[PDB]
Amino acid sequence: GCCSDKRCAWRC
Secondary structure (H helix, E strand, O other), X not given: OXXXXXXXXXXX
């Protein structure tokens, strides 16, 4: 979802 893992990263 809102990931730290860099390419599902919408960055919360």
